[PDB]
Amino acid sequence: MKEKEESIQLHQEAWERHHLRKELRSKNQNAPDSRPEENFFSRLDSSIKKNTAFVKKLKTITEQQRDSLSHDFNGLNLSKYIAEAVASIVEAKLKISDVNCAVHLCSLFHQRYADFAPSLLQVWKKHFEARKEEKTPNITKLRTDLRFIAELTIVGIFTDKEGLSLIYEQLKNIINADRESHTHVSVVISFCRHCGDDIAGLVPRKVKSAAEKFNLSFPPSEIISPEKQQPFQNLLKEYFTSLTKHLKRDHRELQNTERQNRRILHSKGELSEDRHKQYEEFAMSYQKLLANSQSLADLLDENMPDLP
């Protein structure tokens, strides 16, 4: 059966995700007591050429460079180039599939250099400053960014205070940004999909359903405490509420414009004018808003409102 194989996959990914996070968080939180010393740094090379080259490569971090960038990293003394390396990392445009590599590299930095985490945090904050008054949203980057700062917290590079606080901040903006126009929906879904388990305490309907139906035991939430998760869950439901309002409105005004085309069908006979390419745009984005609403109701384990 197809349904069982998908559930086994979900279940397998869940555990891979969980085991990795647990392993990385342990190393990162334990980093301070065993960073290397002066003498060790002496034997790595501080050349400006190589360290600068490396900082540049960090602008295009890619999964298939995991080993190559790691190899270079281990030979360089990056003591003086933290701020620059942090800047490359924050600006770099990562695909969904590249974020784990970036986090891996961030962990090698963090585990070697005390200056890394404070710089990374500080530069992320500035970066969300620059965004707030620059106009034309760049949602593609904010999507990944949110996931990225999420992992960096889960993985213990940022402390709960620093990282949770930073994520809460950026989520608030999305909630406030998206009350009529729900333009960041895919950003909230991605965040939920990837990090909602540990940051928001999410347990989606699919996971619940798979667990009961196939007697699969899914990973426990053990990273962020339920108290710290609650605020995040509240925001998501409140967003979801807002999104369901916007779904109802657009249902009415789709069918108040279908049941208006019935008057303009009878009276003065049809004419598939520009209205026959305006309905093809109202019902395009509705279909996508319905898809995203279903997608997020599941992640949050909420029912969909009923659509006559």
Numbering used by the authors: 121 to 428
Paper text:
MIF4G-1 helices hA, hB as well as their adjacent loops make extensive contacts with the 10-helix MIF4G core domain, in particular with helices h4, h6 and h8. Notably, Arg137 and Arg141 on hA form hydrogen bonds and salt bridges with Asp317 and Glu271 on the core MIF4G domain, and Leu144 on hA interacts with Val223 and Val275 on h4 and h6, respectively. Pro156, Phe160, Phe161 and Leu164 on hB form a hydrophobic patch interacting with Arg232 and Tyr233 on helix h4. Overall, helices hA, hB and h8i create an extensive network of interactions with the 10 conserved helices of MIF4G-1 core MIF4G domain. A highly conserved motif, 164-LDSSLKKNT-172, is located on the first turn of h1 and the loop immediately preceding it. Mapping of phylogenetically conserved residues on the solvent-accessible surface of MIF4G-1 shows that the motif and a series of downstream conserved charged residues (Lys176, Lys177, Lys179, Asp192, Lys200, Glu204 and Glu211) define a conserved patch at one extremity of the domain. Residues 430–486 at the C-terminus of the MIF4G-1 crystallization construct are disordered in the crystal structure. In addition to the N-terminal extension, MIF4G-1 contains two elongated helices (h9 and h10). The updated quasi-atomic model indicates that (i) the long coiled coil formed by helices h9 and h10 protruding from MIF4G-1 is in close proximity to and could contact the EJC, (ii) the loop between h9 and h10 contacts MIF4G-2 and (iii) the MIF4G-2 domain is positioned close to the Y14 subunit of the EJC likely forming a contact.
